[PDB]
Design a binder for this molecule. Sequence first.
Ligand code: MG
Lengths: 387, 137, 59
Amino acid sequence: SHRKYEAPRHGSLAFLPRKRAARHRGRVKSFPKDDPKKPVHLTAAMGYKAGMTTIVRDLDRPGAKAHKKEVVEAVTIIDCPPMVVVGLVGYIETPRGLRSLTTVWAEHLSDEVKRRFYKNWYKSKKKAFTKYAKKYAENNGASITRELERIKKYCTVVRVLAHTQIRKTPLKQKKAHLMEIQINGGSVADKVEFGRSLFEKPVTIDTIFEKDEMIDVIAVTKGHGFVGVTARWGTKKLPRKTHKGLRKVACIGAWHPSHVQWTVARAGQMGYHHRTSVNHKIYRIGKGDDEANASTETDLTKKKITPMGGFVRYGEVNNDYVMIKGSVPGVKKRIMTLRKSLFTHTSRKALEKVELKWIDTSSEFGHGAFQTAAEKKQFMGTLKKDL
Amino acid sequence: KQKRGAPGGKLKMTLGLPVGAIMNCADNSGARNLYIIAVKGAGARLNRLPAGGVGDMVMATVKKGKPELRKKVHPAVIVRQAKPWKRFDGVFLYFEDNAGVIVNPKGEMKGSAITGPVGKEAAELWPRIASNAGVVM
Amino acid sequence: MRTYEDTFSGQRIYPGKGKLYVRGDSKIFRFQNGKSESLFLQRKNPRRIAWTVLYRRQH
RNA sequence: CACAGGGAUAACUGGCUUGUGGCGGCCAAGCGUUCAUAGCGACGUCGCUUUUUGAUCCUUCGAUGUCGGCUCUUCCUAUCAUACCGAAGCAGAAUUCGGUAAGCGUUGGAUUGUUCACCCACUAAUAGGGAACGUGAGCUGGGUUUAGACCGUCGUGAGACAGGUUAGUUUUACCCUACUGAUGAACUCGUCGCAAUGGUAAUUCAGCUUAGUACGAGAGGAACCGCUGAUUCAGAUAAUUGGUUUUUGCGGUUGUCCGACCGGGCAGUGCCGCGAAGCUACCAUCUGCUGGAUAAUGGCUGAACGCCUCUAAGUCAGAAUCCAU
RNA sequence: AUUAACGAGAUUCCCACUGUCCCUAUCUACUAUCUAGCGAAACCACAGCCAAGGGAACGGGCUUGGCAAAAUCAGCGGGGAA
RNA sequence: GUGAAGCCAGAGGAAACUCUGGUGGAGGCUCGCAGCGGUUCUGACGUGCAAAUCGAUCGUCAAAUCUGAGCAUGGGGGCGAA
Ligand SMILES: [Mg+2]
């Protein structure tokens, strides 16, 4: 007989395989559509997630109830030390898909990247690219300069291999991360020469992104061990007087089709899935050499964005950083991935031009009350340990 | 075409009191408490009781007061609640008690005076309650 | 932007922190954190609380 | 109450039939101020379905757990609302008849064990059904349907009543398969990639302006574009607010024990106040894309059939549909 | 036919109270979990992937199709008319 | 805990008589530990610690209360506040 009262479905079938992600680093599955009339430019970056904080600004939205008044919004801080180009790859088209056919690395590599190709680096001989270097300084790089011509002739898209400098962060890890970034240049000749220039030289994120524009975020979510049905999918709990368990589901299928189906809710893994979050606004790109990268045009204090005592379960930020409106998937210290957007934004809310007015820098380790130690001292008075 | 009573433009806030709540009454209409039986702009979902917050219309009866108002169903509006909630400016606030007034379906009050403070949201949406109230927030 | 002073304990308050409590007789109180608010609701006296700003000034 | 047996023989599912039950057609005397077919339809007649009830007894009596409710998934269209359209005894508004269409929804309560029903209120709407009359090693045990007991009618009596009432034990999964997840031998060890196939996701409403305008004698009274919000659903996150306290962190305090003070044990965490970190809440915050091909319908050129005609050859636009991103 | 006191008797309403509920969240102890030692039972024609067909009128085995890759761990309660 | 008869003193009234304060300690009376019993959770376990147990919550508790040993009634017979 039919179901008495109707109701929607618990959980979504779109994100169906609820299993642990296959790899720890996020995976960009599609790059923005190529346009051959722009100038050459990269289309992605990568960094580390520091924490969250609070700001205050004034709104510019004609017709709203809060037009030209002060709002309170949450933001997140990503720590982005520069990247170093290492090489480039070229793909051609085939009746079975795209495929790569050449790679050309740079002459000298760092210990950071070389540590990635090994699982036991300490008791090794570290001979990663030793013989490859001899290709350079042999017949004047003849073998090197032929592969590049091949990419110029046959290939149709080009990508750049880049790696981070993890030694410039408070992390305990020493193994760098490596990934690919596509170039949307204008011609295959142009975008291979531009790639060649950037060999073994750092590139900063302010040449990649720009303020108050919309981006996409890719990462791997937080992990929970092994959870029941009530928390995994969100089903109602059974009455208090139920024998043989209460936090369950009651009917997992009708007599016929005679098998348990793939659409019923059951216990298993929670978290550590791959996710792609979209439509995030950039509020600020802060430089690292500046010593007032948390001030504003109205709050003329001199301070840096690190709270009083460093972000909890993280160090301090001494590099460039980006401020993003909202939340992003992933815990602190985890490798974040940023990339340009695929959509077209004409909504009068994604086109707003933001100008902040205050940035919180209080301690998140408790009920923090002051902004700077100078402020605390002048208010606190004098203590017994100040001699 | 008599439009169904529902405040237009009301931003979302934490709903403090559901169906079955007994709030106070703050006006000279002769009632003392109010018993909620419905909420106007309510939705529809299995097992979920409807609820409302400061500012929106409610259908309610009276259970103790002048015998000329009892055993009937009146439209009412809430004016202050006891559960914290935040505005766009980022500050939380809350009163001591739950209270409401009796109105017309068109939006006119029945009584003539309000006794106590009033939430800012109620003033903006209903012009009559604002013009007749004292201290707001 | 603006800042406020805690009613019970005189601590400074920035935007977003604390809450605002309105008493029955149209008097508005602000508390910087839970500790101030909880003590006030128990009818305690600020004068006898050692860490208050008023207690320090009084002595 | 007992024994030997019976599916040769009943009470439930399943199977053939469809009288009764439900739904749809064909002719046209007439209703509709005049006018058979805007909307209906007598006297007759042709069908469809197995969510009603009957008829039969084919399968189970060395047993297939027999009412209802709670939770959950999926399927059908005879379409309540949502998309786009064709008709009217369609001026506007509110409505009635039909098409493509099952993608997306279809509520909160008082009385009854109820299925069924009838009232209150919100909403865009509160459509109809199947899966062994879905669902008891998933729950509950209010009713029926063991033994105790009371009343009324019947019987001389033991006792009877699809008459009323009260109290009455709900067992087992570790095996196989199915499902949710997690390892893994063979071609040396690794890093960076392609994508066959499988899955798929968003939904509805409100306010301002258009507008006191088009329409109409008047009373009344719309719509596209534009702007801002909200209901249901989905994926994350913890700066702020709240919850949690074995941080047994700090303090207060009762009884007893260490001769007294200090410092401590025990009262399965003695009790109370505050309480960081972590976890967490539409009780908190952020986010949810656009290309192709079409159906109903409206058209262009145009014969068959010197005229006409959206179709016969060719072709244009086009939906919450279908396939992809 | 009434009836004060009495009742682990059946039934209706009111005040106070609450996680019964809206709507779920967290903490503690003992298992479940892994290891060393010891170490059973119920049950079992052969065994174990589906759709339609016909058949004793609801097949794991038959006919026609779909398909189909070693060995395994923790849960689960659709089926084996268990 | 409540406080029945019997006894002492005082006060009001013309009289008949009526009031007030103590003393005393009755009741198949009452709250509530041990013993005795077994209402609810329709809780735990349900190839159990156990062929009827465990936990919390409950009924009675100075009398028709609980209990040991010796003796009597024997199967169409005994015994039964049924
Ligand atoms: Mg007019």
